[PDB]
Amino acid sequence: GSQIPASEQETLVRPKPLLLKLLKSVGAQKDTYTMKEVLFYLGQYIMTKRLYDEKQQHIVYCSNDLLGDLFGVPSFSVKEHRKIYTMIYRNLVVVN
Numbered sequence: 223g224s225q226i227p228a229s230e231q232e233t234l235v236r237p238k239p240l241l242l243k244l245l246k247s248v249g250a251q252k253d254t255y256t257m258k259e260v261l262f263y264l265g266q267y268i269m270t271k272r273l274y275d276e277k278q279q280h281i282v283y284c285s286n287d288l289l290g291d292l293f294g295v296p297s298f299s300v301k302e303h304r305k306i307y308t309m310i311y312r313n314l315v316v317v318n
């Protein structure tokens with residue numbers, strides 16, 4: 223949560239095909255993204271599709287959704303910051 227450095231938002235990534243499919247439904251297509259962008263587009267995907275129950279323990283429900291196949295989970299909490307970064311990282315390649 224608070225032990226995640228700000229520098230993490232600047233990491234450059236090439237999404238794997240399924241994460242890219244998902245990103246293409248909410249943002250401009252491109253080869254390389256920042257982590258800031260991947261987080262904003264994933265957030266926008268979830269909110270637009272009404273996958274997130276805010277006043278219900280802050281859980282994203284994704285078992286009826288491609289997001290679920292991407293993450294390998296039926297649901298998760300937006301408070302599980304390290305978990306989320308990990309599930310995202312497994313769906314992309316870091317570039318440098």
Ligand SMILES: COC[C@@H](C)c1nc2cc(-c3noc(=O)[nH]3)nc(-c3cncc(Cl)c3)c2n1[C@H](C)[C@H]1CC[C@H](C)CC1
Pocket residue numbers: 260261262264265266268269274280282300301302303304306307
């Ligand atoms: C449903 O998402 C809507 C979006 C606007 C959002 N609402 C958050 C609430 C909290 C929060 N955290 O603690 C609390 O109590 N609420 N945190 C985040 C957060 C922000 N940056 C890094 C991470 Cl891993 C988490 C939130 N997001 C970020 C943009 C979204 C979270 C889900 C992942 C897959 C994409 C990114």
